[PDB]
Amino acid sequence: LLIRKLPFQRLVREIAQDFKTDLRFQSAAIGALQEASEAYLVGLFEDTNLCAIHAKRVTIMPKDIQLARRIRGER
DNA sequence: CCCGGTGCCGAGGCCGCTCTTTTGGACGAAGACAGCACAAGCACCGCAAAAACGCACGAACGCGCAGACCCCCGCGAAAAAACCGC
């Protein structure tokens, strides 16, 4: 895993702090969340690279991300 | 077969009416006219502009280098809570 394990834990807790106050986490929940997040982001970067190559470029730009999320059907 | 007499049909008379042609001879000059405005389409010439391609150049990003930073790695401690049982 490329992201670390403690900043990601803090991010997850911060996000979870909105839906219910003072929620405990479990052995393999944060690990699964990190695996899913990194897999998702790698797929998104694959699609972004495809779009950037389509535009005859090598640099990925935010509009490529936006196009990828639009075609995937993401809101 | 004969008498009294009347009302019905015939070819013609005649009356009021409607239709037709005509309106002197010759000469001169001037002036104003003698289908049109309107209509859709063919075959053609033309300018304004698109989506894309070709060229030039300037700057903002990559590359390269020496520096500062804190993510990452490694270590040891404590015990919440996950996995198991009845």
List, chain by chain, residues whose CB lies under 7 Å from nucleic acid strand B: A 3-4, 7, 24, 26-27, 59
Q: Is A31 helix (H, G, I), strand (E, B) or coil?
A: helix
Q: What is the distance in angstroms measured between the alpha-carbon CA of A56 and the sugar C1' of B50?
A: 23
CA atoms within 13 A on the CB side of A7: 4
Strand B, nucleotides < 7 Å from a protein CB: these are 61-62, 71-72, 80-83
Nearest by Cα to A33 from A16, A8, A10:
A8
- What resolution in angstroms does the PDB record give? 3.6
Q: What angle do CA A72, A37, A43 make, to 5 degrees?
A: 40
Q: How was this structure determined?
A: cryo-EM
Q: What is the distance in angstroms measured between the alpha-carbon CA of A70 and the sugar C1' of B56?
A: 36
C-alpha span between A5 and A37 (Å, rounded): 13
